[PDB]
C-alpha cells in the first residue's frame, strides 16, 4: 500500500550488500527484579505488539520498487517464558540463549518474522525479558516506548482496569508527511543546501589507516562506556558559561578526533531523530538521519570559537534535515557500496531508558545497535556538570585498550582547558606523560664515530688484507693491493684532465670492474662521483651534465657520440687497467666533502641532483658493518644500478670490511633466471633486492632450484618499497636465508631505519607489510601532526629524518632544499627532513609506513613525480592540460609484485583529436624509458569532483580490446608469442601489433614470458628483449633473427 521512507530506503540498500546473518535486527534485554507475573506479562506483550502498526508491515519485491503495508491479518505470538532457573547452574546459559536468537538469518529476505520477545530468569527475584525488531521497523527512539507500552498495559491489569489505548500514531501519516515534503519548495530548498554542503565537505577519515568500509560491517561492535568523574568539565563549563554545555563536549570530541584522525578537516556524522515536530514523534517505525558534518579546526581559535561555529552549523543543519542522507549520497556519483561520506559518527541522545513498575528494578542491556562501519561517539554533559561518554567501534578496526588509552586522552584535554581557557586550539597536546619520554630512547642512536673518508676506510682496509680477493667480473680479479694500485692510477690520472678536490665526475660506464674502480678513484682525489643512466634520452643527460657541472666525463668509447653535443665537456674513456705505481692513498678527500649525486624526479618537471657528505655516507656503512658483519670469507654482489643510491654500500662496503665483491653481467639485475646463475656461479652471500623483485626472483623459484643458487646466501636486504610480511615468509620457507628490511630517501644516506624480516621477529607481524623499523646510528625519526607536535602510538603522522645522514641539499637549488630541509622545532640550529612518508609508530618502537602524503609514487622501487610527467605532457603540442595516473590496467598482471603502469590523460586545446602514437614517441625524447605513460588518452575534458578537484576514481581505464585492429599474426612465431600473450594477460591475443605494456604487461610480468618462450622455443629470449620489442610483431623478428 506504501512506499519506504524515512530511514527505510537507506536502511534497506544496507541490508542488500550486507553479508551478515542480522547486521540490521536492533535487540536488548531488560533486567527485572522482584516477584513477576510471567504469563500475565506473556499477555501483555502481545496486546502492546498489536498497537504499533509497524510491527505487522509486511514488505514485498515489486520488480525493483519496494512497497509496504500493514498486515491488519497478523496476529501476534504469545511470548515463550524459559524455565532455566533452577537448572544450568550459570544465568549465562541465558545469554547465550539470546546471543544465539541473533545468529540465525534475520534478514527480511529469509521470511522469518522480524519481531520476536521471550521471558526468561525463570524467577531467580530476578528476569531477563529479551526483545528484537528489525530495524526497518524500529528506531532506537521507538522500541523503547513499545516496551513502555508493554509495561503500561500489563501495570494497568493488575490495578483490574482496562487495557490501555495505543499512544501510538499510524505509521502511515508519517509517508503522507513526507509524500508531501518531496512534493513542496522546501525539498529543492534542501537538496540545493546540502549540494553546497557536499561542494564544501572535507574528506573523510578515520583513527584506523584502513580504507573506509562501505558496506557489510559487524552488527556486533565494541561498545565502551566511560565516566569522568575529575570534574575537570564542570570547572570547564562555568569558567566559559557562554557555550552551552553540550557544544563544549562536541568542540572537544571534535579536537580530539581531528588529533586521531591527523586532520585538521574532516567529515564527521551527526545523528538527528527526527521526532519533535513531526508527525512521526507518535509513529513506531525508524526515522532517523545520521547527515555530515563539516569539521574544521583552526589553529588559531580559543576553544569556544571552535563550539560557536560548529553550533552555527549544527543550527543550519537542523534547519534541512528532513533531506533524506540517502538522497545526498545518489545526488553525488557515488552509489552502491562507494567509499561513504564521513567516518566517525557523534552523537547526543540517550544510553538507556526507564520503567517504573512498582516493587520492580528493571534495567535495559543493550545487545545489537545496528553496525558500525567505524566509529561511533556518544556525549553526554548533564546539568551537574559531570560528563560521560560511550564508544561504539568497527571490531575489525579497533581493540578496547588502545580505545581506553584514546579516551584518557580526552580526559587530557578536559584537564588542560581547565586549567587555561584562554587556550588555543593549537596549543594542545594529547602525549600522555612517560609516551614523549619513551619515544626519547628510540631516538637516543648516538654512537660517537671518528672523522674520516671513505677512501681512508678503503686505504686502511687493503693494508691489514693485501692479498685477499677484493673485485672480480668475468674477466677480471684483483687483491686488495692490486685494486688499490688501480684505484691510485686512475686518480692520479684524473688529476692531469683537472679533476680537483670539490669537483664532480660524471660516470656513463657499462657494469664491470671498472666502474667500481672509476668510483673508488674519484673519492680517492677527493671529487663527488656522478652516475648516469645511459638509458636516459640525449636530452635528459645533458640536463644533469648543464646542471652539475662536472669536471669531467668517464665513459666508453663508443658512448661519446651521444655527448659531442654538449659543450665544454672534457671525457676519459676507460675500460681496462693502468700501468700500477704503487698504492700509497692521496689524502685527497676530506668528511665535509660531497662524496656522490644522485639525481632524483622532481615535481617541476626537471630532475634535482641529491649532495651526499662524505660523513654521512661513512656512518651508514660503519653501521651496517657493525649491524650485519662481514668477514672477507663473505662475497658481495654488485647488482644495482649505479644510478639508484642502493648501489653505493654494494660498491664501497665490502672493501671497508675485507670482502669481495663480484659485478653481475649487464641486464642480469632484471632477469631472475640470470641472477640464479651468477649467485651459484660467485658464491655470493649478500646482496640486495626490491621487493617487487624480491616477488619475481621467488616466483622463479622452487625448493630444487632455491638451494642450488640461493645455498651461499648469508644476508639479503630488502628496501624502496612497503615489504610485505607473506612475501618474506615465501623466502624463509625457500632459503632460511635471513633477510632485512631498510627504509630511507635519498636524501639521507641510503637507508635511515632497519628490521629483521626472517624467524620470530617475522612470526610476530600481524600487519600486511613488514616495519620499516628502528634508526640507525646517530639518526632519528620524527612523526608529527600537521601542527608539528609528536604524534603517540598508533596515530598516523608525517615522517620526518634527522641526524648525521642528512643529505647536504639539493644541486643548485636552495628553494627546494628550504622547503625540504626544515628547522627541527626540537633541536633548535638542526635540521630535519621532510620525507612525504606518512607513518606510525608500533607499540614495540618500530614504525610503521603508510603512504605518501603527496604525489610521489614508488612504481616497483623506482622513484616518479606524477608532477614531472604533468608538466612534461602540458609542454607537448596542443595539449592544454596532462594528468599521469598510476593503475593496474589488467588484473591478470597483478601476480605479484607492484603491477601498476603509468597512464597519461589529455585534453587538447584546439579541441581537436591528437596524435597521441606521435605524442608518446615524443615523450620518449624528454623522459626516463620507465616515465613515459603506457598509454595515452585523451579526454574531452577532466572529470571532477563536487568540490573542482580531480577526480582520479572517475579516470577510465585503457580498454583491453583496441577499437583498431591490425593485421592477424603470421604462423610461426608471431602465433606463439600471440598465445603467450594470452596465457599471461588473460585475454585472447589476435592482433601481431598488440602492445604487451598496452595490454597490462609490466616488467616482472616480461620477465615471466621471456622464460616461458625460452621454454618453447630453444632458443633464448631475454626479458631485456620483450622491453624493446614491445610488440608481438617486434618481438618476433628478434627470435626469427637468422
Ligand atoms: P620494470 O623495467 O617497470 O621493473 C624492473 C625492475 C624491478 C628490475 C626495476 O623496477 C628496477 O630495477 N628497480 C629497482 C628500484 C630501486 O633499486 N630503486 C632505488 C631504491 S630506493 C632509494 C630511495 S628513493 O628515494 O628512491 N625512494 C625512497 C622512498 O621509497 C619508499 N621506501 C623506501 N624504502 C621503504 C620501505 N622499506 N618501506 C616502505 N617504503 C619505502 C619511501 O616512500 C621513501 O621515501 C633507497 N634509499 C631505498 O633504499
Given at each position: 500500500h506504501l512506499p519506504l521512507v524515512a530511514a527505510q530506503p537507506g536502511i534497506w540498500m544496507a541490508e542488500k550488500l550486507s553479508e551478515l546473518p542480522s547486521a540490521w535486527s536492533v535487540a536488548h534485554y531488560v533486567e527485572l527484579t522482584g516477584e513477576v507475573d510471567s504469563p500475565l506479562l506473556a499477555r501483555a506483550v502481545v496486546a502492546g505488539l498489536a498497537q504499533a502498526d509497524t510491527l505487522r508491515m509486511r514488505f514485498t519485491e515489486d520488480n525493483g520498487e519496494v512497497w509496504q503495508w500493514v498486515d491488519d491479518a497478523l496476529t501476534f505470538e504469545l511470548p515463550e517464558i524459559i524455565d532455566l532457573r533452577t537448572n544450568i547452574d550459570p544465568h549465562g546459559t541465558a545469554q547465550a540463549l539470546m546471543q544465539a536468537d541473533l545468529q540465525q538469518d534475520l534478514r527480511v529476505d529469509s521470511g522469518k518474522p522480524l519481531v520476536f520477545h521471550q521471558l526468561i530468569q525463570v524467577a531467580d527475584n530476578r528476569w531477563y525479558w529479551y526483545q528484537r525488531y528489525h530495524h526497518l521497523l524500529v528506531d532506537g527512539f521507538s522500541f523503547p516506548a513499545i516496551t513502555r507500552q508493554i509495561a503500561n498495559i500489563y501495570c494497568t491489569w493488575l490495578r483490574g482496569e482496562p487495557t490501555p489505548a495505543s499512544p501510538f500514531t499510524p505509521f502511515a501519516d508519517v509517508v503522507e508527511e513526507y509524500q508531501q515534503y518531496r512534493e513542496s519548495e522546501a525539498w529543492q530548498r534542501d537538496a540545493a543546501f546540502?549540494?553546497?554542503?557536499?561542494?564544501?565537505?572535507?574528506?573523510?577519515?578515520?583513527?584506523?589507516?584502513?580504507?573506509?568500509?562501505?558496506?557489510?560491517?559487524?552488527?556486533?561492535?565494541?561498545?565502551?562506556?566511560?565516566?569522568?568523574?575529575?570534574?575537570?568539565?564542570?570547572?570547564?563549563?562555568?569558567?566559559?558559561?557562554?557555550?552551552?554545555?553540550?557544544?563544549?563536549?562536541?568542540?572537544?570530541?571534535?579536537?580530539?578526533?581531528?588529533?586521531?584522525?591527523?586532520?585538521?578537516?574532516?567529515?564527521?556524522?551527526?545523528?538527528?531523530?527526527?521526532?519533535?515536530?513531526?508527525?512521526?514523534?507518535?509513529?513506531?517505525?525508524?526515522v532517523l538521519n545520521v547527515?555530515?558534518?563539516?569539521?574544521?579546526?583552526?589553529?588559531?581559535?580559543?576553544?569556544?570559537?571552535?563550539?560557536?561555529?560548529?553550533?552555527?552549523?549544527?543550527?543550519?543543519?537542523?534547519?534541512?534535515?528532513?533531506?533524506?542522507?540517502?538522497?545526498?549520497?545518489?545526488?553525488?556519483?557515488?552509489?552502491?557500496?562507494?567509499?561513504?561520506?564521513?567516518?566517525?559518527?557523534?552523537?547526543?541522545?540517550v544510553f538507556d531508558y526507564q520503567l517504573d513498575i512498582p516493587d520492580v528494578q528493571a534495567q535495559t542491556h543493550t545487545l545489537a545497535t545496528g553496525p558500525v562501519n567505524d566509529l561511533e561517539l556518544a556525549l553526554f554533559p548533564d546539568v551537574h556538570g559531570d560528563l560521560s561518554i560511550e564508544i561504539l567501534a568497527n571490531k575489525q578496526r579497533y581493540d578496547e585498550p588502545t580505545l581506553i588509552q584514546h579516551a584518557e586522552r580526552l580526559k587530557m584535554l578536559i584537564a588542560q582547558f581547565a586549567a587555561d581557557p584562554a587556550l588555543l586550539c593549537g596549543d594542545v597536546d594529547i602525549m600522555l606523560p612517560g609516551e614523549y619520554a619513551q619515544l626519547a630512547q628510540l631516538n637516543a642512536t648516538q654512537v660517537e664515530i671518528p672523522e674520516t673518508t671513505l677512501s681512508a676506510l678503503v686505504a686502511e682496509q687493503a693494508a691489514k688484507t693485501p692479498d685477499a680477493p677484493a673485485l672480480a667480473d668475468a674477466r677480471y680479479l684483483f687483491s686488495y693491493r692490486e685494486m688499490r694500485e688501480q684505484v691510485v692510477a686512475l686518480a692520479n690520472l684524473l688529476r692531469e684532465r683537472?679533476?680537483?678536490?670539490?669537483?664532480?665526475?660524471?660516470?656513463?660506464?657499462?657494469?664491470?670492474?671498472?666502474?667500481?674502480?672509476?668510483?673508488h678513484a674519484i673519492v680517492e682525489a677527493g671529487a663527488a662521483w656522478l652516475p648516469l643512466d645511459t638509458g636516459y634520452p640525449d636530452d635528459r643527460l645533458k640536463m644533469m651534465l648543464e646542471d652539475a657541472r662536472?669536471?669531467?666525463?668517464?665513459?666508453?668509447?663508443?658512448?661519446?657520440?651521444?655527448?659531442?653535443?654538449?659543450?665544454?665537456?672534457?671525457?676519459?674513456?676507460?675500460?681496462?687497467?693502468?700501468?700500477?705505481?704503487?698504492?700509497?692513498?692521496?689524502?685527497?678527500?676530506?668528511?665535509?666533502?660531497?662524496?656522490?649525486?644522485?639525481?632524483?624526479?622532481?615535481?617541476?618537471?626537471?630532475?634535482?641532483?641529491?649532495?651526499?657528505?662524505?660523513?654521512?655516507?661513512?656512518?651508514?656503512?660503519?653501521?651496517?658493518?657493525?649491524?650485519?658483519?662481514?668477514?672477507?670469507?663473505?662475497?658481495?654482489?654488485?647488482?644495482?644500478?649505479?644510478?639508484?643510491?642502493?648501489?653505493?654500500?654494494?660498491?664501497?662496503?665490502?672493501?671497508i670490511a675485507g670482502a669481495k665483491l663480484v659485478m653481475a653481467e649487464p641486464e642480469a639485475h632484471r632477469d631472475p633466471l640470470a641472477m640464479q646463475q651468477f649467485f651459484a656461479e660467485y658464491g655470493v652471500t649478500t646482496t640486495h633486492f626490491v621487493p617487487?623483485?624480491?616477488?619475481?626472483?621467488?616466483?622463479?623459484?622452487?625448493?630444487?632450484?632455491?638451494?642450488?643458487?640461493?645455498?651461499?646466501?648469508?644476508?639479503?636486504?630488502?628496501?624502496?618499497?612497503?615489504?610485505?610480511?607473506?612475501?618474506?615468509?615465501?623466502?624463509?620457507?625457500?632459503?632460511?636465508?635471513?633477510?632485512?628490511?631498510?627504509?630511507?630517501?635519498?636524501?639521507?644516506?641510503?637507508?635511515?631505519?632497519?628490521?629483521?624480516?626472517?624467524?620470530?621477529?617475522?612470526?610476530?607481524?600481524?600487519?600486511?607489510?613488514?616495519?620499516?623499523?628502528?634508526?640507525?646510528?646517530?639518526?632519528?625519526?620524527?612523526?608529527?601532526?600537521?601542527?608539528?607536535?609528536?604524534?603517540?602510538?598508533?596515530?598516523?603522522?608525517?615522517?620526518?629524518?634527522?641526524?648525521?645522514?642528512?643529505?647536504?641539499?639539493?644541486?643548485?637549488?636552495?628553494?627546494?632544499?628550504?622547503?625540504?630541509?626544515?628547522?627541527?622545532?626540537?633541536?633548535?640550529?638542526?635540521?630535519?627532513?621532510?620525507?612525504?612518508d606518512v607513518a606510525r609508530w608500533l607499540d614495540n618502537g618500530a614504525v610503521e609506513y603508510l603512504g605518501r602524503s603527496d604525489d610521489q609514487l614508488k612504481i616497483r622501487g623506482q622513484r616518479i613525480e606524477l608532477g614531472e610527467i604533468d608538466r612534461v605532457m602540458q609542454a607537448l603540442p596542443d595539449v592544454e592540460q596532462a594528468v599521469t595516473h598510476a593503475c593496474v590496467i589488467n588484473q591478470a598482471a597483478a601476480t605479484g609484485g607492484d603491477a601498476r603502469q603509468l597512464v597519461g590523460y589529455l585534453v587538447s586545446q584546439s579541441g581537436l583529436p591528437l596524435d597521441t602514437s606521435a605524442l608518446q614517441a615524443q615523450l620518449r625524447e624528454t623522459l626516463p624509458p620507465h616515465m613515459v605513460p603506457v598509454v595515452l588518452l585523451q579526454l574531452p575534458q577532466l572529470p571532477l569532483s563536487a568540490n573542482g578537484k580531480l577526480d582520479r576514481k572517475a579516470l577510465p581505464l585503457p580498454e583491453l580490446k583496441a577499437q583498431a585492429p591490425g593485421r592477424a599474426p603470421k604462423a610461426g612465431s608471431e602465433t606463439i608469442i600471440a598465445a603467450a600473450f594470452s596465457s599471461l594477460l588473460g585475454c585472447d591475443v589476435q592482433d601481431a601489433d598488440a602492445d604487451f605494456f598496452a595490454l597490462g604487461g609490466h616488467s616482472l610480468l616480461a620477465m615471466k614470458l621471456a622464460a616461458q618462450l625460452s621454454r618453447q622455443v630453444a632458443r633464448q629470449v631475454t626479458p631485456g628483449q620483450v622491453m624493446v620489442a614491445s610488440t608481438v610483431a617486434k618481438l618476433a623478428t628478434i627470435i626469427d633473427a637468422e
Open positions: 546540502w549540494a553546497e554542503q557536499r561542494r564544501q565537505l572535507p574528506p573523510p577519515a578515520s583513527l584506523s589507516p584502513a580504507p573506509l568500509p562501505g558496506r557489510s560491517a559487524s552488527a556486533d561492535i565494541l561498545r565502551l562506556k566511560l565516566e569522568f568523574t575529575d570534574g575537570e568539565f564542570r570547572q570547564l563549563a562555568t569558567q566559559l558559561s557562554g557555550v552551552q554545555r553540550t557544544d563544549l563536549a562536541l568542540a572537544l570530541a571534535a579536537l580530539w578526533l581531528g588529533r586521531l584522525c591527523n586532520r585538521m578537516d574532516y567529515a564527521a556524522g551527526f545523528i538527528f531523530m527526527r521526532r519533535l515536530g513531526s508527525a512521526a514523534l507518535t509513529a513506531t517505525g525508524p547527515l555530515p558534518l563539516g569539521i574544521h579546526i583552526a589553529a588559531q581559535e580559543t576553544l569556544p570559537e571552535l563550539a560557536t561555529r560548529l553550533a552555527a552549523q549544527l543550527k543550519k543543519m537542523r534547519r534541512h534535515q528532513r533531506y533524506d542522507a540517502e538522497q545526498i549520497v545518489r545526488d553525488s556519483g557515488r552509489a552502491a557500496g562507494d567509499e561513504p561520506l564521513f567516518g566517525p559518527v557523534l552523537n547526543i541522545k683537472g679533476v680537483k678536490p670539490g669537483d664532480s665526475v660524471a660516470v656513463a660506464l657499462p657494469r664491470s670492474v671498472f666502474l667500481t674502480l672509476a668510483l662536472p669536471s669531467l666525463l668517464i665513459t666508453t668509447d663508443d658512448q661519446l657520440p651521444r655527448f659531442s653535443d654538449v659543450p665544454n665537456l672534457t671525457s676519459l674513456c676507460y675500460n681496462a687497467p693502468l700501468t700500477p705505481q704503487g698504492s700509497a692513498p692521496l689524502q685527497l678527500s676530506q668528511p665535509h666533502h660531497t662524496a656522490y649525486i644522485i639525481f632524483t624526479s622532481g615535481s617541476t618537471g626537471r630532475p634535482k641532483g641529491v649532495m651526499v657528505g662524505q660523513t654521512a655516507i661513512v656512518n651508514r656503512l660503519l653501521w651496517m658493518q657493525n649491524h650485519y658483519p662481514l668477514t672477507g670469507e663473505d662475497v658481495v654482489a654488485q647488482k644495482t644500478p649505479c644510478s639508484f643510491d642502493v648501489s653505493v654500500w654494494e660498491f664501497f662496503w665490502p672493501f617487487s623483485m624480491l616477488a619475481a626472483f621467488v616466483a622463479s623459484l622452487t625448493p630444487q632450484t632455491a638451494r642450488q643458487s640461493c645455498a651461499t646466501l648469508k644476508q639479503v636486504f630488502c628496501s624502496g618499497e612497503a615489504l610485505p610480511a607473506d612475501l618474506c615468509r615465501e623466502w624463509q620457507q625457500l632459503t632460511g636465508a635471513p633477510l632485512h628490511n631498510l627504509y630511507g630517501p635519498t636524501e639521507a644516506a641510503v637507508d635511515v631505519s632497519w628490521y629483521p624480516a626472517f624467524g620470530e621477529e617475522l612470526a610476530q607481524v600481524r600487519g600486511s607489510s613488514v616495519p620499516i623499523g628502528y634508526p640507525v646510528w646517530n639518526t632519528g625519526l620524527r612523526i608529527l601532526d600537521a601542527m608539528m607536535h609528536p604524534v603517540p602510538p598508533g596515530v598516523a603522522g608525517d615522517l620526518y629524518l634527522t641526524g648525521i645522514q642528512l643529505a647536504q641539499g639539493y644541486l643548485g637549488r636552495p628553494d627546494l632544499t628550504a622547503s625540504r630541509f626544515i628547522a627541527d622545532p626540537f633541536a633548535p640550529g638542526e635540521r630535519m627532513y621532510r620525507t612525504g
